[PDB]
Amino acid sequence: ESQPRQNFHVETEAGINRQINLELYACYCYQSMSFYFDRDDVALPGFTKYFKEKSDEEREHAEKFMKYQNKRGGRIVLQDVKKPDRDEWGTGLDAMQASLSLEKNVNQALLDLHTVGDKHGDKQFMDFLESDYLEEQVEDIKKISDHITNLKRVGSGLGEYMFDKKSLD
Amino acid sequence: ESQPRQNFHVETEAGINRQINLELYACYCYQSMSFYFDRDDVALPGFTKYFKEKSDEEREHAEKFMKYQNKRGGRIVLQDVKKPDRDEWGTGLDAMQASLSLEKNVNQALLDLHTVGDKHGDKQFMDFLESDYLEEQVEDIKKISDHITNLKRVGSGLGEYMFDKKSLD
Amino acid sequence: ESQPRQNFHVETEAGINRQINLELYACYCYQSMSFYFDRDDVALPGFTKYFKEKSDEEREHAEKFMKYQNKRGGRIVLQDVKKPDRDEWGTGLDAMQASLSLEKNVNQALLDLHTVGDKHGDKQFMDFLESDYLEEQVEDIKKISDHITNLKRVGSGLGEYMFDKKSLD
Amino acid sequence: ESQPRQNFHVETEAGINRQINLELYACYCYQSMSFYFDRDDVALPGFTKYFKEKSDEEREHAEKFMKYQNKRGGRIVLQDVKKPDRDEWGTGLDAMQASLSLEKNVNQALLDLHTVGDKHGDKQFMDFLESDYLEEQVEDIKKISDHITNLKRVGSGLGEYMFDKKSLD
Amino acid sequence: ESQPRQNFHVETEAGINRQINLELYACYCYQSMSFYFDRDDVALPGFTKYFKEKSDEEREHAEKFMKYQNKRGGRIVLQDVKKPDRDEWGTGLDAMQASLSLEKNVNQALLDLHTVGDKHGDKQFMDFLESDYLEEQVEDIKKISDHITNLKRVGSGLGEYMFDKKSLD
Amino acid sequence: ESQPRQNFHVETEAGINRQINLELYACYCYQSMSFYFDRDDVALPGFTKYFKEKSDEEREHAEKFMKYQNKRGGRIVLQDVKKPDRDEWGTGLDAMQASLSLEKNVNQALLDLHTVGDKHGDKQFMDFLESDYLEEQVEDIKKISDHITNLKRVGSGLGEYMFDKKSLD
């Protein structure tokens, strides 16, 4: 048993490794979304940058978990990360819909991992999840919702173009 | 009778107390419009900020009346401030429409309060209303009117989105 | 069902709405206290400024709940905010007493709202209440207690006048 | 029952009082290790500085609990703080092993203190423990483990000398 | 046929796509080596940093190919990126060994991809590879070679610990 | 025999070790006094700060004896540090009374220690004691004496409060 290990259950540890793979997967989806909007026949530079940034954020969420596995004495076991479920992503609105669903899946995965650590009274891993993940998920879910409502409000064509300029930095 | 009291009628004092309540009511309405436009299914951030600012303004209007009540030696008697008459406020135009109707009702009440001061020869109170409320009401009613005209000009959909970006700071 | 909703129980949504009303009620009490100490026959400017700041803090607490309600996909339903139970507030000691009682009431309400989010497994909402409200309430209740003790220590007359200058900034 | 006291069980209050004594004991051990490496026949100044900082940290942890105890309206009851279990701490590696052992005991005492708060529904005390102690214990325990591994990698003599230079700042 | 497509053979487009996967695989390998060396029972932080930088460099290389794919009019097709062949990487020397081998494999892949562009007369794509990838691969192979030579020269134990401080920044 | 030892008697080395303990006990007494004045029913924040500082000083006094023990080739032997003889400390005058009495006991212990160095012709130790301790004690005893006088002069209630503001920084 590892030098740091203390109040750290095998299930919690196994649960962290899968969340790592899930975050790496979301990272990979947004990377695909990013370069999809870089296609010459889509060419929406705001969406390109917006999804590049979210890809980098998911990569960072993954590595924060990997680092946390080491802090508690756990051991990182990596898995294949699957190519995303689509090769392209439609309109700006379609991609934002897909992002919301993906974020709500990730949010549920977090809440399930929270229940895991709760059953094992992993008091510190609970506070880790609440502080560094659960709040930011709630924030991102509301932001993406707001983007959906506005992508619907502006319509297609010019309206999507403007949203690309004005709502995405 | 209070140390400062001079040329200050009980009708004026009572009328100040109910104008305080009306400004607090107008404050609460704009607070309600503000967060209505923050709902994920509305999500116009300029209208949110704009009505948060108007809500803060009305609170200052009320507190300045309280401050003035004490200056003249009257006594602040507060009342319930009723919830606004709506839970949601429609489109940007709808809310600006309702804003104009509220501001003109506040302006008419200020004019009636001036009339109370005039009939009691309260020279200073009349100038106070003219200087710190009547001029600002005229400015604001005209701005809100300018907004109504432009909300109509741009139309629903992309137009309302553009107005939110370009006319509300 | 709204786009952001996830792990968000109808009972929690309803508890947030009545916490909103409780914060606005606290705000309104402190506004009343502030301008009571501005009366020409009270005229304690430190107590005036101190209670203005608490009033603005309570308004901030209410609006943070409103913002959070929208974040989780809940819907704000406002209610009348009732006039505070007193029109005058006695001595500095008396008002500070009444403040401590008010703050402990708000703290018990927050704890009961916490209990609600717990029974529904709202791990994010529990952390939000702990992060943005429970720690501050403990801080504030201790501060007001120190003030009561010191307002007893200094006594009446010059004592209260010196506390006004030295302990409220 | 003290002015701030609310939701604060006497088991928690007594739990804090004995945790206070536990942190002061770790402070006193680290103090002893610091000056032990200051002996002319030991003379590792990096280790001397390290453990003085550790001793100072533990002093802050203890005083942070005394402050919190007063915050909730508990009453601090101090006890004898026993001398540490050794007068000399061997090699750099020995002292670092002894540190890991001491930290995990303190971590366990904190998790037990958390369970006391949990059983009495002290939501604010639970958060205080997770935010200001548990995360730092997990950090420090991983950090000491890294030093253990490296003190072993470098071996005795020159290795221990370079570690004193290159890893203790 | 996409708007930019000119002198761009489907075999080139497809070689780019699988080169992308290899660069993402190389990225994922270095990520694993990085967090391996972050393990409490390894704890070589200079190696941790070193591979985290190489991981990010590979990610850049992958995205630079996705960007170039869109520039020529091809279409990114992403595949699963496989978990690395090891869960742990041994000593610093072992991991550096592994890194040289992985880098030479990728260099060979790039040379083969060049050959594909050469047979189809893709002048711009050959230069693109020489300028942003081939020169960098020669540089990196020589530097990893140097590190191996020095990892052997220093030996194990204290020697590896000094290489971690003095050769890895 | 230790490398630096010269002109250094074991009665002197033993006398240093029990002065170390006596300094840590005074450190602990002052720590107690500090947080007693941090109680919500005492709430004298100038006294809190004054005694925290006096406690940090005594800690330094103990560590300077620890440092000197090692300088001369002696060996530090620590003992339990007794909890202070009181759990609370009364009014401000009361605590400053206790402080002067504790400080005069520390001074007499130092004078007795100086007699030990004198009988064994420890010329350096006698100078060390005169330079870094005997002069500070005479300063501090005078300052506390002045504080007593003024605490009596101001009396109870407002006087105490104003002493806490104007005489303790």
Ligand SMILES: [Fe+3]
């Ligand atoms: Fe994520």
Ligand SMILES: [Fe+3]
């Ligand atoms: Fe996210």
Ligand SMILES: [Fe+3]
């Ligand atoms: Fe107004």
Ligand SMILES: [Fe+3]
């Ligand atoms: Fe207005």
Ligand SMILES: [Fe+3]
């Ligand atoms: Fe509040």
Ligand SMILES: [Fe+3]
């Ligand atoms: Fe408060």
Ligand SMILES: [Fe+3]
């Ligand atoms: Fe600690």
Ligand SMILES: [Fe+3]
């Ligand atoms: Fe610690």
Ligand SMILES: [Fe+3]
């Ligand atoms: Fe590469």
Ligand SMILES: [Fe+3]
């Ligand atoms: Fe490379």
Ligand SMILES: [Fe+3]
């Ligand atoms: Fe002293």
Ligand SMILES: [Fe+3]
């Ligand atoms: Fe001393």
